[PDB]
């Protein structure tokens, strides 16, 4: 792979002349997926896309002669009727469905696109950390089998060892790439509502889905007893089982509390672990560094602590599962505890 740094016609400076095309393709989802920039739905269901493509790979598959899917290819995009079908992707088609015609029209591969929109997206919600872009992954041939995607009801073993086997990720990488659900919400956990959030911070890049996955969960906030739902400790916000049983878990809950008022590691980790992420299934070394096509992460605005408690809650309502270091102190926002207010996504999701 032989780079030539190029200026591009809109007067920027790139690794590889390659990349000047991609402005174009920023310019559009932009406008017209993001709707003007947002940390919205759209920018949220694009990061999940980014997971669902590229996990589903695996070597232990391989190994026994069956296909185990090609990692960051496409392939959710390319076979959507079969990959979306599965019930781990479920509610996926409709961000699928939004993406095709830009892949279309700009003629780049779909892999790349997901990868793509992906870190442009995270770009969007203040506190992101500085995103990459590489390019470089050719269009699936045969889609992934199912089987491969965590579910929110899986023990934390099952999904340790998933990850273990499709990248060669530990228990801690786990940890880091799961910081996206700070920058989420649930559409079809919970038949009776969509939109909950998984912290009350949706649109922030921050540490709160560490702190409030950490307190007590009280009651559901819609219906109750969805299968992979737990209790939840606010009005508004959901938690699955996956991440309340990853917070508890002796092997990961210090990596968990790790992020709480660090918002140096978890930009880092994330930083790392989103990367690693988008080349899976590719060769690092054959592929094109397109970074400087992504916009600069922004700060977040204001001036309250990074991380904080929730109103109404205190550390008394933190469960502590971290035996080397104490729950940090945290400041608690003045007042009433408030709902988390949902995010109705477009139609279909
Ligand atoms: C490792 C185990 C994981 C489990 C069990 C899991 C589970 C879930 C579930 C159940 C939902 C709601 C889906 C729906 O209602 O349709 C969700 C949403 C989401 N997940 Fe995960 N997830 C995992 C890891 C990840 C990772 C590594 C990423 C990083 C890209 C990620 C990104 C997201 C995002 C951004 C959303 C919000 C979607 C939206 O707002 O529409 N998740 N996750
Ligand atoms: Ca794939
Ligand atoms: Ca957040």
Not at 74 to 86: R, Y
């Amino acid at each position: 792979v032989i780079e030539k740094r190029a200026t591009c016609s809109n007067g920027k400076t790139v690794g590889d002349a390659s990349c000047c095309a991609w402005f174009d393709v920023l310019d559009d989802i932009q406008q017209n997926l993001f709707h003007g920039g947002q940390c919205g739905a759209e920018a949220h269901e694009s990061i999940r896309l980014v997971f669902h493509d590229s996990i589903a790979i695996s070597p232990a598959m391989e190994a026994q002669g069956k296909f185990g899917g090609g990692g960051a290819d496409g392939s959710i995009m390319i076979f959507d009727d079969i990959e979306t079908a599965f019930h781990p992707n479920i509610g996926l088609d409709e961000i699928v469905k939004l993406q095709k015609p830009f892949v279309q029209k700009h003629g780049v591969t779909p892999g790349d696109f997901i990868a793509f929109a992906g870190a442009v997206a995270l770009s969007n919600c203040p506190g992101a950390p500085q995103m990459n872009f590489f390019t470089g992954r050719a269009p699936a041939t045969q889609p992934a089998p199912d089987g491969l995607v965590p579910e929110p009801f899986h023990t934390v073993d099952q999904i340790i060892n998933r990850v273990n086997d499709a990248g060669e990720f530990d228990e801690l990488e786990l940890v880091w790439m799961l910081s996206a659900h700070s920058v989420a919400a649930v559409n079809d956990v919970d038949p009776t509502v969509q939109g909950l959030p998984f912290d009350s911070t949706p649109g922030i890049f921050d540490s709160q889905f560490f702190v409030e996955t950490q307190l007590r969960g009280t009651a559901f906030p819609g219906s109750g007893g969805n299968q992979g739902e737990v209790e939840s400790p606010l009005p508004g916000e959901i938690r699955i089982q996956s991440d309340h049983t990853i917070a508890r878990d002796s092997r990961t809950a210090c990596e968990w509390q790790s992020f709480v008022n660090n918002q140096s590691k978890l930009v880092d980790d994330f930083q790392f672990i989103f990367l690693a992420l988008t080349q899976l299934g590719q060769d690092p070394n054959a592929m094109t560094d397109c970074s400087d096509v992504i916009p600069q992460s922004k700060p977040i605005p204001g001036n309250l602590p990074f991380s904080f408690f929730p109103a109404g809650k205190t550390i008394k309502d933190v469960e502590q599962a971290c035996a080397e270091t104490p729950f940090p102190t945290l400041t608690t926002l003045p007042g009433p505890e408030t709902s988390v207010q949902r995010i109705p996504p477009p139609p279909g999701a």
